[PDB]
Design a protein around this ligand. Structure first.
Ligand SMILES: [Ca+2]
Ligand SMILES: [Ca+2]
Ligand SMILES: [Ca+2]
Ligand SMILES: [Ca+2]
Lengths: 68, 165, 308
């Protein structure tokens, strides 16, 4: 489920905030193995401020489909 | 009754004689002013102060009156004659008509003017009160006022009889 | 209740007007709100969204970093996103209040009526531990009225020249009194019925002062006109009287004044000596009857009027 950063079966503002905190390393860990995968929204291997921007823009619906 | 009247003293006379027209008001209620317009034939008559025989000019104001002489109310005189065309036109009024009214006693009957007409010819001639463009709404060249500053109506205008030979 | 509540406000304007609809957060927990998202729907045929200002509730020194919106008029929607951007919980919402202000123009051809702005989709709100928080939703919208809203109150009344005149001429003698509110730049001029109305008068319960003025007229001062809403100073059957005859403006009616009329004595409409304002009663000539009008208030000064 591309984007479900906290793995609760929804993609919402809660994911984006957790992600911001993860990328900062202000929370040490995402809740699961799938989570980490969900977090990499541009399927580019790394999880960082780009995912954050992408997720941010998908939530605003400026981007139609995620995985890109 | 209630009227403004122009009477003459003599029915006839000789070239160089001075006929005395008298203008008077009878029972005008709360009378405080007036303006009149008299006409005559200048080729037959000459408007003339009946006491000095001097010819009337544009600004000559007729003497004689026995009303509106109470200086506590500020009388004013205005003459606008045109003797070259046989027109006499003059006015008189109290200024402070209030103080006048404030006292109750109205001046309702008396003489307002005395005009001399110096005979210039033995022709038969008339002198009339008469309407003028200068006095719209006036009654036959006459407008009378009360101590409210309002024009007065419903009085008779009594013209003098024709002057013969 | 004491639970979290998202509320679209309400507003009203005429078509063409710009209006602000607030969006409120009520019931914000001690722990703080760190994130929310939702869609709001509206009628683009009635409202045109100008922009969405982030609320006072958004406390990031650069609120746009934490708060975002996308307007989609063809989809008839506005998406709202809030994700506290500090990444340390420092910019969590911690008070009840305004979360965002929708700024909209009511389109010029909009129908009268109430246009709904409704929360149409909902994502989540979550506290500063990132635990989602049950939320209650309340719609709102804009009331499109054709009622004209005002700069305030209407001061009005009737003025009458104190002297006789022919009906046919009343239109002239009755129009042209300027009533002005002293100390301000507000005035009005009477119409052919002697009626004036000053509009847009700021409330003042201390009272204003009115100054009525017109060429040839004795200026009049009405004091202590308290305004607590629309005010009528006088009525047609009982107008404010104006005295004529202050021809040489000095606030006294006297010889100097009468003198001016006499200088034009017996002149008629078209005559050279003629001067309309001196034909006091507009009967076509200047004569003793005009002067007699003036004599009505011979000796008078402004102070001579009544205070009421
Ligand atoms: Ca989620
Ligand atoms: Ca990435
Ligand atoms: Ca004056
Ligand atoms: Ca007149």
């Amino acid at each position: 489920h591309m984007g479900d950063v906290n793995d609760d079966g929804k993609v919402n503002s809660t994911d984006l905030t957790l992600l911001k905190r993860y990328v900062l390393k202000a929370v040490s860990t995402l809740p699961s193995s799938k989570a980490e995968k969900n977090a990499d929204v541009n399927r580019d291997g790394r999880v960082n401020s780009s995912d954050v921007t992408i997720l941010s823009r998908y939530l605003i619906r400026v981007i139609e489909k995620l995985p890109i | 009754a209630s009227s403004i009247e122009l009477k003459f003293d003599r029915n006839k006379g000789e070239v160089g004689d001075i006929l005395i027209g008298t203008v008077r008001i009878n029972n005008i209620k709360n009378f405080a002013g007036f303006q009149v317009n008299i006409v005559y034939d200048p080729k037959v008559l000459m408007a003339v102060d009946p006491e000095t025989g001097k010819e009337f000019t544009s600004s000559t104001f007729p003497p004689g009156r026995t009303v509106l002489k109470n200086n506590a109310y500020g009388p004013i005189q205005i003459a606008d004659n045109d003797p070259e065309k046989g027109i006499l036109n003059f006015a008189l009024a109290y200024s402070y008509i209030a103080g006048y009214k404030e006292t109750g006693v109205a001046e309702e009957s008396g003489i307002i003017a005395k005009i001399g007409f110096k005979i210039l010819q033995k022709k038969s001639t008339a002198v009339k009160f008469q309407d003028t463009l200068s006095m719209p709404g006036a009654i036959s060249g006459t407008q009378l006022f009360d101590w409210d500053g309002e024009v007065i109506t419903g009085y008779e205008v009594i013209q003098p009889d024709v002057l013969s030979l | 209740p004491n639970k979290l509540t998202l509320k679209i406000g309400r507003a009203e304007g005429r078509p063409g007007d710009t209006v602000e609809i607030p969006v409120n957060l009520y019931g914000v927990p001690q722990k703080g709100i760190a994130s929310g998202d939702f869609v709001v729907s509206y009628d683009p045929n009635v409202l045109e969204i100008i922009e969405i200002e982030p609320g006072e509730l958004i406390v990031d020194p650069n609120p746009t970093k934490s708060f975002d919106t996308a307007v989609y008029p063809d989809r008839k929607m506005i998406v709202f996103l809030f994700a506290e951007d500090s990444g340390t919980g420092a910019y969590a919402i911690t008070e009840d209040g305004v979360f965002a202000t929708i700024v909209a123009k009511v389109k010029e051809g909009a129908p009268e009526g109430f246009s709904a702005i409704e929360i149409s989709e909902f994502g989540a709100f979550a506290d500063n531990d990132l635990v989602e928080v049950e939320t209650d939703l309340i719609n709102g919208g804009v009331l499109v009225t054709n009622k004209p809203v005002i700069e305030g109150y209407k001061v009005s009344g009737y003025i009458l020249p104190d002297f006789s005149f022919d009906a046919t001429v009343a239109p002239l003698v009755k129009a042209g009194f300027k009533v002005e509110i002293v100390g301000t730049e507000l005035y009005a001029v009477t119409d052919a019925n002697g009626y004036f109305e000053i509009t847009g008068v700021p409330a003042n319960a201390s009272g204003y002062t009115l100054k009525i003025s017109r060429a040839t007229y004795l200026d009049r001062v009405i004091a202590n006109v308290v305004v607590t809403g629309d005010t009528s100073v006088s009525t047609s059957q009982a107008p404010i009287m104006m005295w004529v005859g202050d021809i040489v403006k000095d606030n006294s009616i006297n010889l100097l004044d009468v003198a001016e009329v006499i200088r034009c004595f017996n002149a008629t409409k078209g005559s050279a000596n003629y001067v309309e304002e001196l034909d006091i009663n507009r009967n076509g000539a200047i004569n003793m009857q005009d002067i007699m009008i003036v004599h009505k208030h011979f000796g008078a000064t402004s102070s001579d009027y009544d205070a009421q």
